[PDB]
Design a protein around this ligand. Structure first.
Ligand SMILES: CCCCCCCCCCCCCCCCCC(=O)OC[C@H](CO[C@@H]1O[C@H](CO[C@H]2O[C@H](CO)[C@H](O)[C@H](O)[C@H]2O)[C@H](O)[C@H](O)[C@H]1O)OC(=O)CCCCCCCCCCCCCCCCC
Ligand code: CLA
Ligand code: CLA
Ligand code: CLA
Ligand code: CLA
Ligand code: CLA
Ligand code: CLA
Ligand SMILES: CC1=C(/C=C/C(C)=C/C=C/C(C)=C/C=C/C=C(C)/C=C/C=C(C)/C=C/C2=C(C)CCCC2(C)C)C(C)(C)CCC1
Ligand SMILES: CC1=C(/C=C/C(C)=C/C=C/C(C)=C/C=C/C=C(C)/C=C/C=C(C)/C=C/C2=C(C)CCCC2(C)C)C(C)(C)CCC1
Ligand SMILES: CC1=C(/C=C/C(C)=C/C=C/C(C)=C/C=C/C=C(C)/C=C/C=C(C)/C=C/C2=C(C)CCCC2(C)C)C(C)(C)CCC1
Ligand SMILES: CC1=C(/C=C/C(C)=C/C=C/C(C)=C/C=C/C=C(C)/C=C/C=C(C)/C=C/C2=C(C)CCCC2(C)C)C(C)(C)CCC1
Ligand SMILES: [Fe+2]
Lengths: 78, 45, 31, 32, 61, 31, 35, 430, 309, 34, 50, 37
C-alpha cells in the first residue's frame, strides 16, 4: 500500500535472479530478429541486393491509391 | 546480401547490457522517487 | 500619391489606436 | 588480428589502472 | 640485439605500471609514507636505472 | 512618398522609446 | 584629408587617455562596501 | 585527505577553490598539471611518428606536432624532404620520461608534502597579499622564459640553424649568422596595424626578424626578472590592482586568451614560422596557387589572361581571389616586380619547382569538413579553430575571475547584506 | 577633493545620473552614437555599393528604391578585402561611398560600443554591491555579433562576407552561408537551436508556474504541480538553482553557436553525409542529406557569378 | 510495499523491454557487411 | 518572440543570481536557501535600479 | 613508423594520447568514492 522504495528491490535477490536471466533473452531475441533476416520480411525493408530489380533500375513510384497494394507488391519484386 | 557475421559477441554484450541496465534503471528512479514520497507524505492537494 | 489606399490604411491604423489609447490615458489620469 | 586484440588489452589494462588505486584506498581505509 | 632491448623495455613497462599503482596507494595510506620510504626509493632507482640501460641498448641497436 | 512614411514611422518609434526611458511614471510601487 | 585624420586622431586619443586615467584614479576603492 | 563543504564552503564542483590558501597542495597540483602537459606532448609525438609516412607530405596526414619539430630543422633537408625520423622519436621519449618525473613530483606534493609551505620553508612560502614574494616568483619565471628564448636563439645561430622557407630554390635548413637586432625593425611590427596588408605581428616574413625579436625578448625578460626580484610595486601600482590569488588568475586568463587569439591568426595567415610544406598552404596561398596554375597552363597551351589592377594600382591575380592580393610566398616572390606581378617574368621566368609547388597547393586548400571528408582538413584549420575557441573561453574566464576577485576584495562576493542595501541609501528616481 | 579632475571623476562614476556613464561609458557613448548616426544616414541616403567588386553595384538605401524589409547597409567591396578603409584613406568621398566604407565604420564603432557596454554592466554591478556576472551572460550575444561581423570576414578573407546591416541582407547572408558551409548539420548550430528553443520553453514555463503561484509558496506550492506533471520530483527545488539553470542554458547554447560560426569561418564545416549509403554493386541510395545537398548546390550555383564583366 | 504488478511496474517495463530488444537489434545491425 | 524569450530567460536568471541576499556564511550561495522561506531570495530594488 | 627495434610496441602507443582525457574522469570517480562530500 506504500509502493515499496527502489532501494529495497535493488538489494533483493529474486529481482536480480529474474533479470540477469531475462534481459539477455531479450537482447538475443533482438539480435536474432535482425540477424536471421526476419526484420526485412516483417517490415518490408529490402535487402541491400534487392533495392533495384532486374526490370526496374530507378526508384519506385506508387502513382496509384486504391490499387497501392498491388503496386507495392509488383514494385518490391514479390 | 545482409547477414550478421559475428557469432558469440551477442551473449557477451547482452550480459553486460542487462547488468548495467538493472542498476542504471533502479538508481535514478530511487533518487527521483524519494522526494515524491516526501512531498505526497503529509502535505498534498 | 502612390497607393492611396495603402496610405489611408497606414494612417488609420496609426491614428485610431493612438487616439483611443491617448483618450483612455487622459480619462484615467483625471482620477 | 593480433594487433587489435593487443590494443584492446592494453586499453583495458590502462583503464583499470586508474580505478584500482581508488578501490585499494577505499578498501584499506585510505584518506581519499 | 633487438630482443634484449625489447625484453628490457617490457620489463620497464611492467615496473612502471606497478610503481604507478603503488605510489599513490603508499602516499594516501595513513602512516604509510614513512613506513615504506625505502621500497618507494628502491623502485624509483630501479625505474631510472632501467630507463638508462634501455637507452644505452638502443644506442647499440 | 514611401520613404517619408518609413522615416516617420521609425522616428515615431524612436520618440516613443525616448519618452518611455525619460518620461516614465516613477517606480515607487517597490523601491 | 589630413585635417579629418588629425581631428579623428585627436578625439580618439583624448577619449582613450580619459578612460585610462579614469581606471587609474583608484577605481577599486570606490564601492559601496566597506573593506 | 580532502576537505569538506562545511569546513571550506566550496562545493565539490568548485573543489579546487579550496587550494587558494594551501601552498603545498597548490604547488603539487601545478606540478602534476605540467607533468600532464608534457605527457600529452610526448604521447602525441610518438603517436604521430608511428603513423607517419615520410614519402607523403605532413599536411596530407593530419600531423600538428611533427611540423613544430621540423621547423626547428630536425631531420629535414631542402624542399621539406624528411631524411630521418629519429629526432622526433627522441623528442617524444624524452618528453614522456620528463612527464613521469613531473607527475611523481606533483603527486608527492599533493598527497604527502606539507599543506602550507610558509611554516618550514620560508623561501618557498608565500601569501597572496604579499607584494614582494609574488614579484620574486614573477621575476624567477621571467628569467626562465628569457632563458628559453635565448636557448632558441642559440639553436638558430650555433646548433645547426632553423628551416628557412625563403631560401632560394625552396626552403632548407640554414644558420642565421646575422639576426636583425635593429630596434626600429624589431619594434615596428608591434605598432603595425592589425588589418589587411599590414599584419600586426603575423607579417614577420624572414627568420632574421624572428631571431632578433627573440634576442630582444630574452634580454628584456631577464632584465625584468632582475628588476622585479630587487623591487617592490610603486604606490600607484598598489592602488590600481587587486592583490589576491584570483586577481592574478584573472590577469593571466586575459593575457593567455589574447595569446590564443594571436596564435590563431598567426597559424592561419603566417607561412614563415609555419612553412607551407609542413602545415600545408594557407587559404590565400591556395587561391593564389590555383590562379597561378591556371594562368601557367593557359599560357603553355596558348588558348594577360586574368590579371587586374589593385585599388592601389599594382598588378594582381584576377577573379574571386583578388581579395588575397597581399599574399607573399617563397614560390611567388621571384615573379614579383616593383609593382605587383611582372608580365615578363610571369611569361618566361617560371621554374619547374614553382609550378609543381603551386599545383600541389592547388588541390589542398583549407577547405575541409568536421567529418573530415574533403572540400581533408588542413592542420592550419584545426589549429586556428581550436585556439580561437580556447582563447574565447579563456577571455570569458578572465571576465568571471576578475569580477569575482574585485567583488571579494570589496566584500560582497556572497550577496547583498539585506540590512544595509546600498541602493536603499541613494536618491530615488535615478 | 575640490580639484576639477576629482569632480569630473565623481560625476562620471556617480550613481545618481539617470543613465550611468562610467569610464566604459565615456568610451562607448561617442562610439555607439557615431555608429547609429552613420547607420541611419546610410540606410536612408546611401548610394549603391559595389559589394562584389565587379562594377555591379548593389542598392541598399531607402531613397534608391527600397523599403524597410529590403533596405540594408551593404558591406565593403571585395576589392578592399580586409584593408582598413577610413574616410581619409579613400581618394574621394564618392569613392568611399562606392566601395562601402560606412559599413566598416559602423561595424567597428558598434563592436567597440558593445564591448564597453559589457564592461559598464560590470562597472555598475560593482558600484551597487551586486555580484558581477551579468557581463558573462551578455558575452554570448556579444560573442555572436563579434563572430558574424569580424571573425567570419577574417577567416574568409574579406569584409564583403560579413552580415549586411539589414533584414533581407541577413536572410541572404544565411542562405549563402548554408550553401557554402552547410550550417544546419553542424553540431554547434544544433546546440544553438536547442539553446534558443529550450530558453523559450523555460521562460514560458517558469512564467506560467510563478504567475500561478503568486496569489493575493512561490516554490513550495508550484513544485507540487511540476513534480507530477512531467515527473522529475526534486529537480529544481531551489529558487537559486532554477534561476542559474535559466541563465546557463541559453548562454552556453549561444556560446557554442558562436564558436561554430567562427570555426566555419576558418572553414572546417558542418557534417557531410553525402553518398553515405550504398547498396551492393556500389549504387548510391539517397538519404535526406542528399536532398539537403541538392538544395545547397543550387544555392551555391546561384551565389557564384564567375562570369563578371 | 509488498504488492507487485503496480502502475509503476507496467510503466517501467513497457519502455524497458522494447528498449533492450531494439538495442539488441541495432547492435546486430552494426555487424552487417552491406 | 523566440529570441526575446531566450533573452528574457538569460537576463532574468543572471539578474536573480547576481542580486541574491547574503543569508549564508559559505562561499556557495545555493545552500543558503530553503523552500519554506518567507522573503524572496533576491533584491528586487537593486535589480530594478541596475 | 617508429624505429624497427620498437616496432612491436606500436599498439600501446596508439593508446597513450587518450590517457589524459581519463584523468579528469578519474577525479569524478574519486569524488563518487567520497559521496561528493
Ligand atoms: C586593436 C583591436 C584589434 C581587433 C582585431 C582587428 C583586426 C582583425 C584582423 O583582420 O586581424 C588580422 C591579423 C592578420 O592580418 C593579416 O596579416 C597577413 C600577413 O600575411 C602575409 O605575411 C606573412 C608573413 O609570413 C605571410 O608571408 C603571408 O603569406 C602574407 O599574406 C596579411 O597582411 C593579411 O592581409 C592580413 O589580413 O591578425 C593579427 O594580426 C592578430 C589579431 C588578433 C585578433 C583578431 C581576432 C579578434 C577576435 C575578436 C572577437 C573575439 C571574441 C570576443 C568575445 C567577447
Ligand atoms: C615547481 C616545482 C617545484 C617546487 C617549487 C618544489 C619545491 C619544494 N620541494 Mg619539490 N619536487 C618537484 C618540484 C618542485 N618542488 C618535482 C618535479 C619533484 C619530483 C622529482 C619534487 C620532489 C620533491 C621531494 C621528494 C621533496 C621535495 C621537497 C621540496 C621542498 C624543498 C626543496 C628542496 O629539496 O631543496 C632543494 C633546493 C635546491 C636549490 C636544489 C634543487 C636542484 C635543482 C634541480 C637545480 C636548479 C635549482 C636552482 C635554484 C635554479 C637555477 C636557475 C638557473 C638556471 C638560473 C620545496 C618546498 C622536499 C620537501 O621538504 O617536501 C615538501 C622533499 O622531500 N620535492
Ligand atoms: C588535473 C586537475 C586537478 C588537480 C591537479 C587536482 C589536485 C588536487 N585536488 Mg582537485 N579537483 C579536480 C581536478 C584537479 N584536482 C576536479 C576536476 C574536481 C571536481 C571533480 C576536483 C575536486 C576536488 C575536491 C573536492 C578537493 C580536491 C582536492 C585536491 C588536492 C588533493 C588530492 C586529492 O584528490 O585528494 C586525495 C585523493 C586521493 C589520494 C585519491 C587519488 C589517488 C591518485 C592520486 C590518483 C591518480 C594517480 C596517478 C595516476 C598516479 C601517477 C603516477 C606517478 C605517481 C608516477 C589536490 C591538490 C582536495 C583538497 O586538498 O582540497 C583542500 C579537495 O577537497 N579537488
Ligand atoms: C629559485 C626560484 C625558482 C625557479 C628557478 C623556478 C623555476 C620554475 N618554476 Mg617556479 N616557483 C618558485 C620558485 C622558482 N621557480 C616558488 C618560490 C614557487 C612558490 C612555491 C614556485 C611555484 C611554481 C609553480 C606553481 C609552477 C612553477 C614552475 C616552474 C618551472 C616552469 C618552467 C616553465 O615551463 O616555464 C617556462 C620555461 C620553459 C618552458 C623552459 C625554459 C628553458 C629552460 C629553463 C632552460 C634549461 C637550462 C638551459 C638548457 C641551460 C642554460 C645555460 C645558461 C645558464 C648559460 C620552472 C623550472 C611551473 C612548473 O611546471 O614546474 C614544474 C609551475 O607550474 N613554479
Ligand atoms: C610576465 C610579464 C610581466 C608581468 C606580469 C609584470 C608585472 C608588473 N610589472 Mg614588470 N616588467 C616585465 C614583465 C612583467 N611585469 C619586463 C619584461 C620588464 C622589462 C621591460 C618589466 C619592467 C617593469 C618596470 C620598469 C616596472 C614594472 C612594473 C610592473 C607592475 C605594474 C604593471 C605594469 O607594468 O603596468 C601595466 C601597464 C600600465 C600601467 C600602462 C599601460 C598603458 C598603455 C598605453 C597600454 C598599451 C601598451 C602598448 C603601448 C600598446 C602597444 C602594444 C600592443 C600591440 C600589444 C606589475 C607587478 C612597475 C612596478 O610596479 O614596479 C615594480 C614598474 O615600475 N615592470
Ligand atoms: C588555468 C586557468 C584556470 C584556473 C587555475 C581556474 C581555477 C578555478 N576556477 Mg576558473 N575558469 C577558467 C580557467 C581557470 N580556472 C576558464 C578558462 C573559465 C571559463 C569557462 C573558467 C570558469 C570558471 C567558473 C565559471 C568557475 C571557475 C571556478 C574555479 C575554481 C574551481 C575549479 C572548478 O571549476 O572546479 C572543477 C571544475 C569542474 C568540475 C568542471 C569540469 C567540466 C568542464 C566544464 C568541462 C570539461 C572540459 C570540456 C571537455 C571542454 C569543452 C570546451 C571545448 C570546446 C574546449 C578554481 C579557483 C569556480 C569557482 O569556485 O570559482 C571561485 C567557478 O564557479 N572558473
Ligand atoms: C572613444 C571614442 C572613439 C573611438 C574609440 C573611435 C575609434 C575609431 N574611429 Mg571613430 N569617431 C569618434 C570617436 C571614437 N572613434 C567620434 C566622436 C567621431 C566624430 C568626430 C568619430 C569619427 C570617425 C570617423 C569619421 C572615422 C572614425 C574611425 C575610427 C577608427 C580609426 C581611428 C584611428 O585613427 O585609429 C588609430 C588611433 C590611434 C593610433 C590613437 C590611439 C592612441 C592610444 C594612446 C593608443 C591605444 C592603443 C591600444 C591598442 C588601446 C577607430 C575604430 C575611422 C574608421 O575607418 O573607422 C572604421 C573613420 O573613418 N571615427
Ligand atoms: C601509458 C602506460 C602507463 C601508465 C598509464 C596510466 C598511469 C594511466 C592512467 C589511467 C587512468 C588514471 C585512467 C582513469 C580512467 C577513469 C575512467 C575511465 C572513469 C570513468 C568514470 C565514469 C565512466 C563515471 C561515470 C559516472 C559517474 C561520474 C558516477 C555517477 C554515474 C556515472 C555513470 C555518470 C605505464 C607507464 C604504466 C606503462 C605503459 C602504459
Ligand atoms: C630513451 C631515449 C634515450 C635516453 C633517454 C634518457 C636517458 C632519458 C632521461 C630522462 C630524464 C633523466 C628525465 C628527467 C627529468 C627531470 C625533470 C623533468 C626534473 C624537473 C625538476 C624541477 C622542475 C625542479 C624544480 C625546482 C627545484 C627542485 C627546487 C628549486 C625550485 C625549482 C622549482 C626550480 C636515448 C637517447 C638513448 C634514445 C632516444 C630516447
Ligand atoms: C592528484 C589527483 C589527480 C590528478 C593527478 C595527475 C594529473 C597526475 C599526473 C601524473 C602523471 C602525468 C604521471 C606520468 C607518469 C609517466 C610515466 C610513468 C611514463 C612512463 C613511460 C613509459 C613506460 C614509456 C614507455 C615507452 C616509451 C619510452 C615510448 C615508446 C615505447 C614504450 C611504450 C615502451 C586528479 C585531479 C585526477 C584527481 C585527484 C587525484
Ligand atoms: C617575437 C617577435 C618580434 C618582436 C616581438 C616584441 C618586441 C614583442 C614585444 C612585446 C611587448 C613589449 C608587449 C607589451 C605588452 C603590454 C601589454 C599587453 C600591456 C597591457 C596593459 C594593460 C591591459 C593595462 C590595463 C590598465 C587599465 C586599462 C586599467 C587601469 C590600469 C592599467 C593601466 C593597468 C618580431 C616582430 C621582431 C619577430 C616576430 C615576433
Ligand atoms: Fe523568476
Amino acid at each position: 500500500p506504500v509502493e515499496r522504495p527502489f532501494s529495497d528491490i535493488l538489494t533483493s535477490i529474486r529481482y536480480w535472479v529474474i533479470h540477469s536471466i531475462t534481459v539477455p533473452a531479450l537482447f538475443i531475441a533482438g539480435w536474432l530478429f535482425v540477424s536471421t533476416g526476419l526484420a526485412y520480411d516483417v517490415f518490408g525493408t529490402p535487402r541491400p541486393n534487392e533495392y533495384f530489380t532486374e526490370d526496374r533500375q530507378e526508384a519506385p513510384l506508387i502513382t496509384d491509391r486504391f490499387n497501392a497494394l498491388e503496386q507495392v507488391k509488383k514494385l518490391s519484386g514479390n | 546480401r545482409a547477414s550478421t557475421e559475428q557469432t558469440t559477441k551477442r551473449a557477451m554484450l547482452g550480459l553486460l547490457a542487462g547488468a548495467v541496465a538493472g542498476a542504471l534503471l533502479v538508481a535514478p528512479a530511487e533518487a527521483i522517487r524519494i522526494p515524491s514520497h516526501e512531498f505526497t507524505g503529509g502535505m498534498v492537494k | 500619391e502612390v497607393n492611396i489606399y495603402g496610405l489611408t490604411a497606414t494612417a488609420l491604423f496609426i491614428i485610431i489606436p493612438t487616439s483611443f489609447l491617448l483618450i483612455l490615458y487622459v480619462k484615467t489620469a483625471s482620477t | 588480428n593480433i594487433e587489435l586484440a593487443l590494443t584492446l588489452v592494453s586499453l583495458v589494462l590502462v583503464v583499470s589502472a586508474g580505478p584500482l588505486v581508488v578501490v585499494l584506498l577505499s578498501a584499506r581505509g585510505g584518506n581519499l | 640485439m633487438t630482443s634484449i632491448l625489447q625484453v628490457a623495455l617490457l620489463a620497464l613497462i611492467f615496473v612502471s605500471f606497478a610503481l604507478v599503482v603503488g605510489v599513490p596507494v603508499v602516499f594516501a595510506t595513513p602512516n604509510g609514507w614513512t613506513d615504506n620510504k625505502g621500497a618507494v626509493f628502491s623502485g624509483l632507482s630501479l625505474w631510472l636505472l632501467l630507463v638508462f640501460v634501455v637507452g644505452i641498448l638502443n644506442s647499440f641497436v | 512618398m514611401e520613404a517619408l512614411v518609413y522615416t516617420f514611422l521609425l522616428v515615431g518609434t524612436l520618440g516613443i522609446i525616448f519618452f518611455s526611458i525619460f518620461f516614465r511614471d516613477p517606480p515607487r510601487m517597490i523601491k | 584629408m589630413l585635417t579629418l585624420k588629425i581631428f579623428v586622431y585627436t578625439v580618439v586619443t583624448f577619449f582613450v587617455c580619459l578612460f585610462i586615467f579614469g581606471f587609474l584614479s583608484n577605481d577599486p576603492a570606490r564601492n559601496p562596501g566597506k573593506n | 585527505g580532502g576537505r569538506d563543504q562545511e569546513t571550506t564552503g566550496f562545493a565539490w564542483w568548485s573543489g579546487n577553490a579550496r587550494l587558494i590558501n594551501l601552498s603545498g597542495k597548490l604547488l603539487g597540483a601545478h606540478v602534476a598539471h605540467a607533468g600532464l602537459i608534457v605527457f600529452w606532448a610526448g604521447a602525441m609525438n610518438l603517436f604521430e611518428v608511428s603513423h607517419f609516412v615520410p614519402e607523403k607530405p605532413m599536411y596530407e596526414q593530419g600531423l600538428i606536432l611533427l611540423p613544430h619539430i621540423a621547423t626547428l630543422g630536425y631531420g629535414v633537408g631542402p624542399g621539406g624532404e624528411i631524411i630521418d625520423t629519429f629526432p622526433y622519436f627522441v623528442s617524444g621519449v624524452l618528453h614522456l620520461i620528463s612527464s613521469a618525473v613531473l607527475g611523481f613530483g606533483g603527486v608527492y606534493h599533493s598527497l604527502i608534502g606539507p599543506e602550507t609551505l610558509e611554516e618550514s620553508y620560508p623561501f618557498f612560502g608565500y601569501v597572496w597579499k604579499d607584494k614582494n614574494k609574488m614579484t620574486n616568483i614573477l621575476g624567477y619565471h621571467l628569467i626562465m622564459l628569457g632563458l628559453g628564448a635565448w636557448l632558441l636563439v642559440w639553436k638558430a645561430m650555433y646548433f645547426g640553424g632553423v628551416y628557412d622557407t625563403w631560401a632560394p630554390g625552396g626552403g632548407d635548413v640554414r644558420v642565421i649568422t646575422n639576426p636583425t637586432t635593429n630596434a626600429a625593425v624589431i619594434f615596428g611590427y608591434l605598432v603595425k596595424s592589425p588589418f589587411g596588408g599590414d599584419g600586426w605581428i603575423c607579417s614577420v616574413d624572414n627568420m632574421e626578424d624572428i631571431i632578433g625579436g627573440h634576442i630582444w625578448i630574452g634580454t628584456l625578460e631577464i632584465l625584468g626578472g632582475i628588476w622585479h626580484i630587487y623591487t617592490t610595486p610603486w604606490p600607484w601600482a598598489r592602488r590600481a590592482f587587486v592583490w589576491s590569488g584570483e586577481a592574478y588568475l584573472s590577469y593571466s586568463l586575459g593575457a593567455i586568451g589574447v595569446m590564443g587569439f594571436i596564435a590563431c591568426c598567426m597559424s592561419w595567415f603566417n607561412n614563415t614560422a609555419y612553412p607551407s610544406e609542413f602545415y600545408g598552404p594557407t587559404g590565400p596561398e591556395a587561391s593564389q596557387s590555383q590562379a597561378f596554375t591556371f594562368l601557367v597552363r593557359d599560357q603553355r597551351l596558348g588558348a594577360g589572361k586574368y590579371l587586374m589592377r589593385s585599388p592601389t594600382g599594382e598588378i594582381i591575380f584576377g577573379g574571386e581571389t583578388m581579395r588575397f592580393w597581399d599574399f607573399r610566398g617563397p614560390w611567388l616572390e621571384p615573379l614579383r616586380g616593383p609593382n605587383g606581378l611582372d608580365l615578363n617574368k610571369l611569361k618566361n621566368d617560371i621554374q619547374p619547382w614553382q609550378e609543381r609547388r603551386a599545383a600541389e597547393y592547388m588541390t589542398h586548400a583549407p577547405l575541409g569538413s568536421l567529418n573530415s571528408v574533403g572540400g581533408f582538413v588542413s592542420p592550419r584549420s584545426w589549429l586556428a579553430c581550436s585556439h580561437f575557441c580556447l582563447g574565447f573561453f579563456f577571455f570569458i574566464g578572465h571576465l568571471w575571475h576578475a569580477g569575482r576577485a574585485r567583488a571579494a576584495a570589496a566584500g560582497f562576493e556572497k550577496g547583498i547584506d539585506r540590512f544595509d542595501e546600498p541602493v536603499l541609501s541613494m536618491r530615488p528616481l535615478d | 577633493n575640490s580639484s576639477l579632475w576629482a569632480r569630473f571623476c565623481e560625476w562620471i562614476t556617480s550613481t545618481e545620473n539617470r543613465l550611468y556613464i562610467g569610464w566604459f561609458g565615456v568610451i562607448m557613448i561617442p562610439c555607439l552614437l557615431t555608429a547609429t548616426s552613420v547607420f541611419i544616414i546610410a540606410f536612408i541616403a546611401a548610394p549603391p555599393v559595389d559589394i562584389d567588386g565587379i562594377r555591379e553595384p548593389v542598392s541598399g538605401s531607402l531613397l534608391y528604391g527600397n523599403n524597410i524589409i529590403t533596405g540594408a547597409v551593404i558591406p565593403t567591396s571585395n576589392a578592399i578585402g580586409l584593408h582598413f578603409y577610413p574616410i581619409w584613406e579613400a581618394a574621394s568621398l564618392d569613392e568611399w561611398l562606392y566601395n562601402g566604407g560606412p559599413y566598416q565604420l559602423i561595424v567597428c564603432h558598434f563592436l567597440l560600443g558593445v564591448y564597453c557596454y559589457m564592461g559598464r554592466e560590470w562597472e555598475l554591478s560593482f558600484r551597487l554591491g551586486m555580484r558581477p556576472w551579468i557581463a558573462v551572460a551578455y558575452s554570448a550575444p556579444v560573442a555572436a555579433a563579434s563572430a558574424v561581423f569580424l571573425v567570419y570576414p577574417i577567416g574568409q578573407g574579406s569584409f564583403s562576407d560579413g552580415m549586411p546591416l539589414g533584414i533581407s541582407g541577413t536572410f541572404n547572408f544565411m542562405i549563402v552561408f548554408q550553401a557554402e558551409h552547410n550550417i544546419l548539420m553542424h553540431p554547434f548550430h544544433m546546440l544553438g537551436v536547442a539553446g534558443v528553443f529550450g530558453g523559450s520553453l523555460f521562460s514560458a514555463m517558469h512564467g506560467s508556474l510563478v504567475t500561478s503561484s503568486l496569489i493575493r509558496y512561490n516554490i513550495v506550492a508550484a513544485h507540487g504541480y511540476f513534480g507530477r506533471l512531467i515527473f522529475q520530483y526534486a529537480s529544481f527545488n531551489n529558487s537559486r538553482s532554477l534561476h542559474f539553470f535559466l541563465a546557463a542554458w541559453p548562454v552556453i547554447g549561444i556560446w557554442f553557436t558562436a564558436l561554430g560560426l567562427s570555426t566555419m569561418a576558418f572553414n572546417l564545416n558542418g557534417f557531410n553525409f553525402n553518398q553515405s549509403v550504398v547498396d551492393s554493386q556500389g549504387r548510391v541510395l539517397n538519404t535526406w542529406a542528399d536532398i539537403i545537398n541538392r538544395a545547397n548546390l543550387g544555392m551555391e550555383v546561384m551565389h557564384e557569378r564567375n562570369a563578371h564583366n | 510495499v509488498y504488492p507487485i504488478f503496480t502502475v509503476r511496474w507496467l510503466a517501467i517495463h513497457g519502455i524497458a523491454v522494447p528498449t533492450i530488444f531494439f538495442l539488441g537489434a541495432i547492435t546486430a545491425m552494426q555487424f552487417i557487411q552491406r | 518572440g523566440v529570441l526575446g524569450a531566450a533573452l528574457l530567460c538569460a537576463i532574468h536568471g543572471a539578474t536573480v543570481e547576481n542580486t541574491l541576499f547574503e543569508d549564508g556564511d559559505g562561499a556557495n550561495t545555493f545552500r543558503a536557501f530553503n523552500p519554506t522561506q518567507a522573503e524572496e531570495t533576491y533584491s528586487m530594488v537593486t535589480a530594478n535600479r541596475f | 613508423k617508429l624505429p624497427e627495434a620498437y616496432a612491436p610496441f606500436a599498439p600501446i602507443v596508439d593508446v597513450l594520447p587518450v590517457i589524459p582525457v581519463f584523468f579528469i574522469l578519474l577525479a569524478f570517480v574519486w569524488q563518487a568514492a567520497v559521496s561528493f562530500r
